[PDB]
Amino acid sequence: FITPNKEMRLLRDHTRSAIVVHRRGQNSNMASLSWEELERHYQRRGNA
Amino acid sequence: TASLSYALCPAGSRYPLFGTIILDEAFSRSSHAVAGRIIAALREFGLHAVFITPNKEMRLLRDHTRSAIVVHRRGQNSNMASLSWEELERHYQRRGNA
Amino acid sequence: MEENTRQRTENYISAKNQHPAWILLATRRAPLVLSCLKTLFEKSHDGIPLEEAIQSLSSILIEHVSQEQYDINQDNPFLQASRELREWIKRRLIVERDGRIFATDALEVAITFVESLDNRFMTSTASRLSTVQREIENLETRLNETHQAVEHIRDVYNLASSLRADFRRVEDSWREADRALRQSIIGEQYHRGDIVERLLNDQDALLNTPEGRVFDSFQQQLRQSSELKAMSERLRVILSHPSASDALNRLQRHDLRWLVKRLVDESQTVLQARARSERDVRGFMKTGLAAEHHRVGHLLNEFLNLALKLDWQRQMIRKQEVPLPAVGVAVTGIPAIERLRFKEVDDEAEQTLDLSNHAADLTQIGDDFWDAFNGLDREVLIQQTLQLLAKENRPVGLAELAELLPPAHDLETFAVWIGMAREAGIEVIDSQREFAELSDGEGRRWRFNLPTTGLESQALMDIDWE
Amino acid sequence: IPLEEAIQSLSSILIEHVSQEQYDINQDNPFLQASRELREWIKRRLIVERDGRIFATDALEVAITFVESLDNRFMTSTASRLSTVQREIENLETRLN
Amino acid sequence: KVVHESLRTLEKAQRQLNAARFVDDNGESHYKALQVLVAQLRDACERNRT
């Protein structure tokens, strides 16, 4: 499933992993993360 | 938006005499910040927006509107109901950052 | 099954064309012609002279000319009778031989119908009239298996398969005829008549061999579709038998089921294979030799005819050189020393490899992402509504419920509650306003204005939820 | 057979063929057209109506007896192999029923 | 089954083309039908968008 930022809630209900794709100038990088890892990194951002 | 604004200004009118504008489906195609830019531009031209959304974009409607009209259908009929809010400006957090 | 109807109605609509007798009974002049044919054939099975039937039918026609129905014209009875009988003959209602018409099955049944038309219909309701009529009737006459299945089905497949070769064989004949016609055209000796007549001779030539007879027999069997539903239909029946699976491999069975389509589409090849000759003759009518063109073409034809004598197979015999003049000579490729250069570079370097395992940095993107990741759920709240209202066991208003479960992401909660109210039948009213307060992430307090209502655990727990 | 049931059957049949221009069927009112069509025939004593049910008669019997005997084998194949193949398919078909 | 003007016109023309087959003549009416029918086929290849 491709999708823009919106309604990630729906996708959290029907998936087991996600791939983030970062944009920065003219270098773009990706990472494959399970939902749990994403949630923990968000928690750390909340700590950030 | 600018062309629509100009078209509704009567002869030499510095403002448009009619202020209602309808945008069905809100911002289905766009991302977050694009809607904010659009609404800021709409405010600059002094219009009265009426959006339709199928219950999407809640986090955003909350910060550029003052009321709502909920709907729902059951079997073969429908209904409507108002709702409204306002800011109690007396303080954001007294004895705190504001 | 009603499917049989959708075949039955098609059968009937078809039969209401093509098949003559049903066409014969339907055209106004049917009574006259039926009478004439019956009275004629009644006294002879071994043919009747055409002209005699013409005369009888014309005599009958004139007598009824006064009618406006039948469109008979006094000026030419003979032509009208002749044309009518000829048209009927051409529909295979009755074949003609030895100058004599002959009766067939179609006319037989067409007659068998009419004579059974008991005009006693429109019942006289046993009124005395009928009794008198019937007594007069009476007085009047008073004064006067598995092992076989595979082999049989395979034989049928062999037969059907064979057709798809004879069409290629017909193509062979038409290609050969085109080749011979072009060969003869290169000859100088034919009139226009020769060319335009040999094509018709060819057309009649390929109505003789079994292959050609097969083809021309088939062609008509699209116009009078008759059978070309029967074949596919019955094949569908056979392939419906279980044991057929063992008889034929799957691809065969698929192919056979669509036999008619593949034949129709194969026949397209032959029509073109004849086309070429159908186009060649027009190549000779127009460009009648004339002017310098006449004589140049004559020389070309002479040369071509003479060339036939040779044995053209040998390449070395082919490589013999002609006396043709060297014109349009290409002069180029001067072998000057300046034309020569050497490779003029000596550099070298790798496309330096870099397989460093890059990965994204999760800390680099902003809250447009993370707020979305924090989308307010509308599933847990649904459970909590029932959880609280079951405890309260009473109608509770929106203000109370929100004040008991003050949500940070607010508006969606009120919307959800209001919608659930509609779905569960608990009415909500715009008129009677009522108020409540909440605060947001920056402490700012909001004063909502809501509609008056109270939500009961009974209706909500009764109604279902997606 | 109940009158209305036959009306519905005939109307269903009519609409399927409305695309044809031969029959002058109109999409806007199948029920009225089918009803009138059956009624007209009923009036001609082709079939009498009783107990709200149509009933078959001799005239329809013979009219049917004609059609079923229309052997479409006309325009003879002139013994071309096509007919032999068709007839062998005939015989094998019935052999499995 | 689609319903449209030109298809209905083709239905009528084909019915005619069946008709001219049997009328006894040296061949004219058959030719007339087999000309009018192709008239539409060539035309439909000129405006293949509509």
Q: What is the resolution of this structure in A?
A: 4.2
Find, among A28, A27, A32, A29, the residue nearest to A16 by Cα. Answer: A32
Mutate to test the interface with D, among C121, C148, C216 (most CBs of D within 10 A): C121
Chain-chain contact of A5 with B31 (C-beta, under 8 angstroms): yes
Chain C residue with the nearest C-alpha to that of A29: C360
Q: How far apart are CA C327 and CA C163, in angstroms?
A: 56
Q: Mutate which of C213, C215, C248, C267 to test chain D, going by most D C-beta atoms within 10 A?
A: C213
Contact B57 A4 (CB under 8 A): no
∠ Cα C6 C9 C13 (to 5°) = 135
Q: Does A23 touch chain B (CB under 8 A)?
A: no
CA separation for the pair C32, B41 (Å, rounded): 90
Q: Choose among C148, C268, C167, C228: nearest CA to D83.
A: C228
Kindly report the number of other CB atoms within 10 A of residue C387's CB atom: 12
Tokens coding E4: 């449209």
Distance (Å, whole) CA C157 – CA C151: 10
| Bridge partner list, C96 | C101
Taking contacts as CB-CB distances below 8 angstroms, the residues of chain C near A38 are: 373
Q: Which residues contact C77 (CB under 8 A, 6 or more apart)?
A: C58, C61, C62
Residue closest to D70 by CA, chosen among C95, C22, C224, C5:
C22
What C135-144 contacts at long range (C-beta under 8 Å, 24+ apart), as own/partner pairs, is none
Cβ contacts of B60 on chain C, cutoff 8 Å: none
Dist CA C230 CA D23 (whole Å): 26
Listed residue (C128, C82, C129) closest to C101, CA to CA: C82
> Per the structure block, which two tokens stand in for B58?
């809640």
Interface test with chain C among D47, D76, D90, D96, by most C beta carbons within 10 Å:
D96
Calpha distance C170→C211 (Å, rounded): 7
Give C287's contacts (C-beta < 8 A, 6+ positions apart): C293
Name the experimental technique: cryo-EM
* Dist. CA A24–CA C42, nearest whole Å: 104
Sheet with strand C48-49: strands edge to edge: C48-49, C100-101, C96-97
Distance CA C178, CA C198 (A): 11
Q: Which residues of D touch C109 (CB under 8 A)?
A: 66, 69-70
SS (H, E, C) chain B: CHHHHHHCCCCCCCCCCCCEEEECCCCCCCCHHHHHHHHHHHHHCCCEEEECCCCCCHHHHCCCCCEEEEEEEECCEEEEEEEECCECCCCCCCCCCC
Cβ of C235 and D89 within 8 Å?
yes
Contact D21 E11 (CB under 8 A): yes
Q: Distance from D70 to chain C by nearest Cα, in Å?
A: 8
Residue B73, annotated as binding a ligand: yes
One-letter-per-residue 3-state SS of chain C: CCHHHHHHHHHHHHHCCCCHHHHHCCCCCHHHHHHHHHHHHCCCCCCEEHHHHHHHHHHHHHHCCCCCCCCCCCCCHHHHHHHHHHHHHHCCCCCEECCEECCCHHHHHHHHHHHCCCCCCCCCCCCHHHHHHHHHHHHHHHCCCHHHHHHHHHHHHHHHHHHHHHHHHHHHHHHHHHHHHHHHHHCCCCCHHHHHHHHHHHHHHCCCCHHHHHHHHHHHHHHCCCHHHHHHHHHHHHHCCCCHHHHCCHHHHHHHHCHHHHHHHHHHHHHHHHHHHHHHCHHHHCCCCCHHHHHHHHHHHHHHHHHCCCCCCCHHHHCCCCCCCCCCCCCCCCCCHHHCCCCCCCCCCCCCCCCCCCCCCCCCCCHHHHHHHCCCCCCHHHHHHHHHHHHHCCCECHHHHHHHCCCCCCHHHHHHHHHHHHHHCCCCEEEEEEEEEEECCCCCEEEEEEEECCECHHHHHHCCCC
CB atoms A29 and C360 under 8 Å: yes
Please give the angle made by the CA atoms of D41, D44 and D47, to the nearest 5 degrees: 65
Q: How far apart are CA C260 and CA C453, in angstroms?
A: 72
Residue A15, chain C, CB below 8 Å: the answer is: no
For the CA atoms of chain C, what is the radius of gyration?
Answer: 47
Query: How many H helices and E strands in chain D?
Result: 4, 2
Beta bridge partners of A33: A18
DSSP secondary structure code for residue D75 in this structure: S
Q: How far is CA C206 from the centre of its chain?
A: 29
Q: Which residues of chain C have a CB within 8 Å of the CB of D83?
A: 217
Chains A and E touch (3+ CB pairs under 8 A): no
Q: Are C415 and B68 inside 8 Å of each other by CB?
A: yes
C365 Cβ neighbours under 8 A, 6+ residues apart = A22
Closest CA to B89 of C435, C449, C443, C444: C444
Q: Chain C residues with CB inside 8 Å of E24's CB?
A: 83, 86-87, 90
CB atoms within 10 A of CB C107: 20
Q: Determine how β-strand B20-23 pairs with β-strand B48-51.
A: parallel
How distant, in Å, are the alpha carbons of B91, C130, C256, C308 from that of C304? Answer: 110, 94, 49, 7
Residue C210 near chain A (CB below 8 Å): no
Chains A and C touch (3+ CB pairs under 8 A): yes
Which residues on D lie below 8 Å from C5 (Cβ)? 13
Residue C364, sorted as left (phi over 0), alpha (psi -120 to 50) or beta, turns out to be: alpha
Q: Is the CB of B58 less than 8 angstroms away from the CB of C422?
A: no
Q: How far is A10 from chain B (nearest CA, A)?
A: 12
Distance of alpha carbon C111 from alpha carbon C38, whole angstroms: 8
Positive or negative: CA dihedral E7, E8, E11, E12: negative
> What tokens does C49 get?
């002279």
Smallest Cα–Cα separation from B56: which of B35, B78, B74, B80? B35
Quick check: D91 and D77 in contact, CB under 8 A? no
Q: Residue C415: what residue type?
A: A
Please tell me which of the candidates C360, C372, C375 has its beta carbon nearest to residue A20: C360
Do C74 and C62 contact (CB within 8 A), yes or no? yes
- Taking the C-alpha atoms of residue C387 and residue C406, their distance in angstroms, rounded to an integer, is 15
The torsion angle over the Cα atoms of residues C252, C255, C258 and C263, rounded to 10 degrees, is: -120
Tell me whether residues C234 and D72 touch, CB distance under 8 A: no
d(CA C159, CA C179): 31
Question: B-chain residues within 8 Å CB-CB of C409?
Answer: 58-59
What residues in B contact C372, CB-CB < 8 Å? 32
Q: What share of chain A is helix, strand, coil (3-state, %, to 5)?
A: 40, 35, 30
C208: which residues sit within 8 A by CB, 6+ positions away? none
Query: Would you call D21 an interface residue with chain E, using a CB distance cutoff of 8 Å?
Result: yes
In the block, which residue shows the tokens 């097969």? C214
CB distance B62 to C426 below 8 Å: no
Give chain D positions within 8 Å (CB) of E13. none
Chain Cα centroid distance, residue E11: 8
CB of C459 closer than 8 Å to CB of C424: yes
d(CA C5, CA B35): 61
Q: Are C92 and D71 within 8 A, CB to CB? A: no
Return the DSSP state at E26: S
Residues A45, C361: C-beta atoms closer than 8 Å: no
Nearest to A7 by CA among C166, C66, B56, C34: B56
Cβ neighbors of D38 (< 8 A, separation 6 or more) are D3, D6, D7, D10, D54
Angle between helix C146-186 and helix C250-257 axes, rounded to 10 deg: 60
CB-CB under 8 Å, A7 with B56? yes
Strand partners of residue C145? none
Q: Which residues fall within 8 angstroms of residue B36, CB to CB, at 6 or more apart?
A: B60
* Residue C428, C-beta contacts closer than 8 angstroms, at least 6 positions apart: B81, C418, C421, C422, C451, C452, C453
Q: Does A5 contact B57 at a Cβ distance shorter than 8 Å?
A: no
What are the φ and ψ backbone dihedral angles of C320, each rounded to 5 degrees?
-65, 140
The structure tokens listed for B74 are 């059951």
Taking an 8 Å cut-off on Cβ atoms, the answer to whether D20 and E2 are in contact is no
* Element containing residue A47 per DSSP (H, E): helix A35-47
Residues C87, C98 contacting (CB under 8 angstroms):
no
Burial class (CB in 10 A: 0-12, 13-18, 19+), C247: buried
* Strand, coil or helix: A22: strand
CA pair distance E30, E37, nearest whole angstrom: 11
**Which string of b and e fits C49-84 if b means at least 16 CB within 10 Å?**
ebeebbebbbebbbeeeeeeeeebeeeebeebbbeb
CB contact under 8 A, E2 and D19: yes
Q: What's the CA gap between D36 and D30, in Å, rounded?
A: 10
Torsion, Cα of E28, E34, E39, E42 (10° steps): -140
